Amino acid sequence: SESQQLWDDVDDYFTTLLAPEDEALTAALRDSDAAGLPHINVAPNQGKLLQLLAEIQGARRILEIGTLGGYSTIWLGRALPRDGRLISFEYDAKHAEVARRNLARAGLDGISEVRVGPALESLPKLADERPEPFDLVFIDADKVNNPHYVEWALKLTRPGSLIVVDNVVRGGGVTDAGSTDPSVRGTRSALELIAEHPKLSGTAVQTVGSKGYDGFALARVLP
Amino acid sequence: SESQQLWDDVDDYFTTLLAPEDEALTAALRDSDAAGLPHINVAPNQGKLLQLLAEIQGARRILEIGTLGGYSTIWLGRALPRDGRLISFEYDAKHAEVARRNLARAGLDGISEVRVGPALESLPKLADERPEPFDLVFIDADKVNNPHYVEWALKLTRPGSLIVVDNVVRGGGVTDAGSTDPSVRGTRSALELIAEHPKLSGTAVQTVGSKGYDGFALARVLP
């Protein structure tokens, strides 16, 4: 609690100063909490980092795996130009209902879509539509399937596209080479895939904050 | 301490996988330790984040305030083209000598400079040369002077330039409005300048790892 109080106080200062939440973001959380969604959305300073990475990259087209109530989706969508496109995948139809409402409130209903079903079914469907490549992929769903989502990202991106993977530390569980936890297995497999793959270059960072001890990975698709 | 051991183990996993140090980086640290520089270089995974941000930017010109032994400078310099330029500022002449040898060993002598003296005296002399704008500014020197380094960054950049500020958590001290610590006061002033300036938009993230509890800020220059 001494640690967590300090991490809460520092994040409160950073968020209210640099990454303030407007009505669309606060109402998205309220509507998520009201609808029984687990409160596992990115922290606002993390949302702002996602938005800034999309902006720096010049992202026009964004793929997100794991919508929840569209809180991360509103952060990323706000990086996009008026003719941009964001596709988000969500397994739970009721999560998807909340997220669409939250995206419409933010004025992102024109450039965003939530596709319902297991992302490993939805990704091949999107691929069959032969879309223009995506500039940024945010992988934040069932971490067991992280290595499959990275493989799909490689098929749906181009040189200079970004891949962000949330929750890569798992309370410190990521170092256990003999884990029984499938979310650790998928996390380790995905990080090792980024390392080995000659078309990916990445880093990972341990974070603390209002969500506690965790971390994220950032990778670029190389030429 | 269990926390630090876990943070070390996670960082060793992430570093070996995603941000491995080649001999030029290992030798830069060995030479810095040898000459008795403080071991306060960025952690390898933070160095790799700098390099990735510079590559995402397509940076050609980088400004660094606080060289030490040139470890961060090598991560950043590796993103640059043959016609690129990294100008780094270092108070201590001995630090500067180490850093120049370390940058020469990495093959960066041709595109890098280390200018000796207090940065707030050296920066106006750079400005007198009518330099081309910089694409990324890394601020990592005396944190008391952060707000003045952010003001210099604004004068030496263009729209879409990136500013990174290291060590913005100050052991949690950053939230004390009445701080007697000049490093806290400079950190708070630079973060408020990022918030208030219409040409700046940023975030800050608390980190753990091999260097313990800290954090960084990232700001984008807006039109």
Ligand SMILES: Nc1ncnc2c1ncn2[C@@H]1O[C@H](CSCC[C@H](N)C(=O)O)[C@@H](O)[C@H]1O
């Ligand atoms: N196989 C799968 N395909 C698609 N979504 C999945 C999935 N497994 C889990 N999910 C969804 O992944 C989400 C994880 S929480 C996502 C948080 C969100 N990105 C934010 O930061 O605001 C949940 O909504 C869960 O229903």
Ligand SMILES: Nc1ncnc2c1ncn2[C@@H]1O[C@H](CSCC[C@H](N)C(=O)O)[C@@H](O)[C@H]1O
């Ligand atoms: N006023 C000032 N102007 C320039 N350099 C300064 C300064 N005050 C402190 N410094 C330098 O700032 C450095 C801080 S440590 C820099 C670490 C380096 N960026 C890395 O990650 O590898 C020291 O070398 C110190 O001498």
Ligand SMILES: [Mg+2]
């Ligand atoms: Mg998450």
Ligand SMILES: [Mg+2]
């Ligand atoms: Mg530093």
